[PDB]
Design a protein around this ligand. Structure first.
Ligand code: X5V
Ligand code: X5V
Ligand code: ZN
Ligand code: ZN
Lengths: 399, 399
């Protein structure tokens, strides 16, 4: 249960000192990463999130208008061009406000939910880097919700449902929720904080979450919620964050016309469910110990001949499974079938299809699982339907 | 036919001086961009391209090992960290060789086709920037093929087929192909160039392409092919490039074990079909004048009520179309139906579904196109099937 060893064994990714803290994703690791994005996109569709893409660097003058910039200016990579200085973005939020500021908005556009899979970079001390857990370049399942004060409770509800629904998909059902105190120095009126804290407290009560208040001081932007999942080793991983912001929309001049035809500043809700997805893949690799569920497995099925007489059949099957949307590989190598099955079992391929002489003549295929279970000779279409159901439902367990 | 005006009208993207040459993609522009990636991914699947992801910056020491670095060092953004200097990648190729250099390879791994949608940045003079056509950050449909000398002809054939097949999808069928001369200063033996030029010439003859030899000097890496499409205004756009490389794999220490058990340097083939995809969207926006084909349209269907009596029906329909994989929006605003239809026609929505009292009671829906064609009342499932066929086939024209 070391994602760096499993990552190497399954050829998921690598790192080198020429680019510290930045992942080289190999084909199979990138497959897992794209599948996670597909999964995230399907869950946001339910809430009608927009999906946007912001630029990788912006003028330092823009970043200086955010606020508590001094505290983070040390962690950003900077660059320059034509006597102008840029920061590689360490966060997507100011870019999202730029998109919100294009076009007059009014109350009828809110809540405006805007998600991005945007790569961000931070200049972390090299001594703290570790595998996929602590990186310099990361992509989170990021989004920002622009809403009114009244809409906070409903919007925080949606985030809560999204956290519990996405975590359970992977088998994470023990979840701890920590609310945050209000620090000495904050932006915003006391009244505005008091109402927002009421929204958060009401939203957690309706869902019956047992929350604690965290001992350390919270942010200056607004109240904050952090979600911690526990893996099968009962290890704690803080992944989800919901952060209210009364500061950034005002600093970057976001506004909308309200019902009273009066110009107002939207509330921003920053939130991420998985957090850094490089890290979440690290957690998953260890949670499953490399036995990825079928929908996540880089290679879902391997089809093998016993002799060269079945090679044309195996290629036919492979094309058929591939056209049915299954990540499938043919293994036509000159190796004994017991050698091939063992090799692909060690590489954690969910299903293994064996094609001898009986199967070419019958139109069927012999099915073995990576756990060693012998499922017998099955019709090709039966196998396809069963595989498609396991994939579309993102089932955690096999047939 | 100005993509910057159409881009603004349809709310596809914007740019600002805080990040010159770098696109802020809005929801609808990003939808087009992701659809293009889906399309590219489906065409590469046919050739079993891998898809990888490399880091955004690498040590300047690595970039200096490439060769003709002096010529391009002026165009890269540089940054630094812990008394070490990095270049924001202006190209994906050295990152792909790093991935190839992880793991011993042999002849049985070749050809190894490795694609990436990787964002790259170049420090272009601000005076040359223009819309989506000349940017500082761009993503091309990039790939690198590692192969043997013998495999060049077959590999170049695949690229040729991919160029003609992808361009025709968008309606581009007039294509001009230019081969390149051999410059005075080149890397590689004369013999190695002579054989590779024979591979390229044979590959073009088999496909019956009329090629010209370009007047200007070619690259020093190897022979080169450029493909130029013509749009409906008969404007020439050079998009595809196939560039042989005998230099980079040797400089960055790529090798494989051959059949004779002898260590050898692979040939690299750099290729892109669409080129910069920001630019290709610009070309498409002008080619279609904003009337995107259904599969590309940011919003494929809009469903409208006439009064509040049909709102529940419209929401039901919307959820049904959405579950069927159609990008669909309900328009329940308090506006006359003729006003709503005109508005969504001006925004180039392919299909418009009108729900009055007759349609709620009949279970049908009235269909109007963005060209003004009245298709009559249709069963909901008929509409879904027709829409799914137009989408899955990426048809250029409506029903
Ligand atoms: C304030 O913005 C706070 N943001 C978050 O905690 C946050 C959580 C989930 C999603 C998004 O988009 C969020 O912004 C804070 O700014 C986060 C932050 C910490 C450190 C640095 N840094 O460069 O050292 C930047 C941002
Ligand atoms: C040599 O590599 C040549 N490459 C290409 O033309 C190319 C075409 C299609 C796909 C890929 O991946 C390619 O590399 C050349 O290096 C391209 C290049 C031009 C200019 C700069 N620059 O930073 O000024 C970098 C690379
Ligand atoms: Zn944020
Ligand atoms: Zn290249």
């Amino acid at each position: 249960r070391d994602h760096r060893k499993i990552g190497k064994q399954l050829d998921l990714y690598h790192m080198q000192e020429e680019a510290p803290g930045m992942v080289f994703w190999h084909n199979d690791g990138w497959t897992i990463f794209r599948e996670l994005e597909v999964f995230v996109r399907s869950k946001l569709k339910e809430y009608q999130y927009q999906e946007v893409k912001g630029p990788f660097m912006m003028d330092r003058v823009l970043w200086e208008k955010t606020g508590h910039w001094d505290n983070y200016k040390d962690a950003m990579f900077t660059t320059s061009s034509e006597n102008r200085e840029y920061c590689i973005k360490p966060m997507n939020c100011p870019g999202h406000v730029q998109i919100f500021n294009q076009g007059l908005k009014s109350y009828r556009d809110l809540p405006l939910r805007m998600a991005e899979f945007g790569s961000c970079h931070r200049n972390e001390p090299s001594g703290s880097l570790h595998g996929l857990m602590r990186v310099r370049g990361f992509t989170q399942d990021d989004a920002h919700i622009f809403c009114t004060e009244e809409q906070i409770r409903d919007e925080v509800n949606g985030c809560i449902r999204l956290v519990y629904d996405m975590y359970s998909t992977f088998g994470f059902e023990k979840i701890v929720v920590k609310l945050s105190t209000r620090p000495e120095k904050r932006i915003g009126s006391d009244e505005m904080w008091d109402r927002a804290e009421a929204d958060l407290a009401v939203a957690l009560e309706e869902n019956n979450i047992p929350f604690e208040y965290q001992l350390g001081e919270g942010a200056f932007k607004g109240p904050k919620i952090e979600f911690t999942l526990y893996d099968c080793l009962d290890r704690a991983w803080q992944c989800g964050t919901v952060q209210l912001d009364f500061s950034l929309p005002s600093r970057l001049s976001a506004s909308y016309v309200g019902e009273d035809n009066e110009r107002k500043v939207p509330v921003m809700i920053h939130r991420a469910i998985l957090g850094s997805m490089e890290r979440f893949i690290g957690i998953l690799t260890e949670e499953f110990a490399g036995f990825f569920p079928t929908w996540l497995a880089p290679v879902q099925v391997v089809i093998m001949n016993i002799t060269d007489s079945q090679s044309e059949y195996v290629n036919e099957l492979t094309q058929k499974l591939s056209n049915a949307g299954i990540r499938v590989k043919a293994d036509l190598r000159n190796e004994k079938i017991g050698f091939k099955i063992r090799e692909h079992t060690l590489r954690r391929v969910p299903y293994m299809l064996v094609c001898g002489d009986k199967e070419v003549e019958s139109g069927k295929v012999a099915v073995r699982t990576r756990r060693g279970k012998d499922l017998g000779s099955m019709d090709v279409n039966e196998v396809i339907e069963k595989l498609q159901q396991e994939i579309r439902s993102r089932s955690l367990k096999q047939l």
